[PDB]
Amino acid sequence: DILLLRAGLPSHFHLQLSEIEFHEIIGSGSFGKVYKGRCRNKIVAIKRYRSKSDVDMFCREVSILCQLNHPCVIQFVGACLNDPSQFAIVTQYISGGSLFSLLHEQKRILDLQSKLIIAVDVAKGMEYLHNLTQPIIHRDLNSHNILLYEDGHAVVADFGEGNLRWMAPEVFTQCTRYTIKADVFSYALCLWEILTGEIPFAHLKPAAAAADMAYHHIRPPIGYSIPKPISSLLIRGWNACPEGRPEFSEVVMKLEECLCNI
Ligand SMILES: CNc1cc(Oc2c(Cl)cc(NC(=O)Nc3cccc(C(F)(F)F)c3)cc2Cl)ncn1
């Protein structure tokens, strides 16, 4: 199974653990630890791994990562595949921190152009993922999974955390496979999060906020201040009906159009 991955993975992506230099620990998880370090004269982040469940996730992640090549998506450096002790995933380190920190922790006041540049960059990355021959549903797009360069540009990542006529809506929805349009919903919430500088339903806990969007059809408030083209993107973006949400190819277009008038 691992051998099948070794073969499909381009040779230049093959790392030897000795090639990788581990400095500090940045985060933890079910998979193991995430180190910062140095590899091939680059400052990198290393996802070091500690069952068949765990390995299935490892192969999945590498298979995803070796395909990704876009300036708005995380950048794969390589993977070490010799034996399950040495399993690691290396990516180019990004130093500007998450979008979450910029908005809610550093609480920095942002120009509309600064806001729109991050928003466009995230839309491009998503457009990229959705337009792969085998499209990738991020499924967990949020401001924690959006990293920033020091000049204000953004990158999309993933830290890794019967008859229908009479069916209850919650039951119907579980029988309906979700699509890439699930990312457009998440994205819309991020877009609101950018412009307002507030966490979506900040006064609520996560599961409480989710229930109000699903059961009670509540969205974050869209003020008059927010520009017409973007408030439009919001309205259509977090539409309960997936088919009513726009593609990222259109999202990029509308947003780039805005960057010209600013
Ligand atoms: C703190 N600066 C960092 C941290 C860092 O850690 C990471 C991150 Cl953030 C991500 C990943 N790997 C992935 O994101 N993999 C992935 C899997 C499925 C889909 C996607 C995507 F991009 F399509 F959403 C990405 C690994 C590490 Cl070590 N990396 C850089 N700078």
Tell the residue number behind the tokens 């995803």, with chain if given.
64
Question: What residues contact 184, with CB distance under 8 A and at least 6 apart?
Answer: 126, 237, 245, 246, 247, 248, 251
Separation of alpha carbons 70 and 77, rounded Å: 13
DSSP labels for 98-132?
A: BHHIIIIIS-----HHHHHHHHHHHHHHHHHHHTS
The one catalytic residue in 140, 151, 158, 183 is 140
Cα–Cα–Cα angle for 8, 11, 17, rounded to 5 degrees: 105
Return the SS3 of 92: strand
Question: What residues contact 183, with CB distance under 8 A and at least 6 apart?
Answer: 126, 129, 130, 137, 138, 139, 141, 248
Q: Is 140 a catalytic residue?
A: yes
| Ligand 1, atom 30: closest residue by C-alpha | 93
126 CA → ligand 1 middle, Å: 14
227 CA → ligand 1 middle, Å: 32
Distance between start and end Cα atoms, the chain? 52
Distances (CA, A) of 125 to 41, 138, 146, 200, 249: 26, 10, 10, 22, 10
Beta bridge partners of 154: 148
Q: Which atom of ligand 1 is nearest to the CA of 92?
A: 30
262 CA → ligand 1 middle, Å: 32
Resolution in A: 3.1
Residue extents of the structural domains in the chain:
1-95, 96-262
Experimental determination technique:
X-ray
Could you tell which of 22, 98, 158 is best to mutate to test the pocket of ligand 1, judged by most ligand atoms within 8 Å of the CB?
A: 158
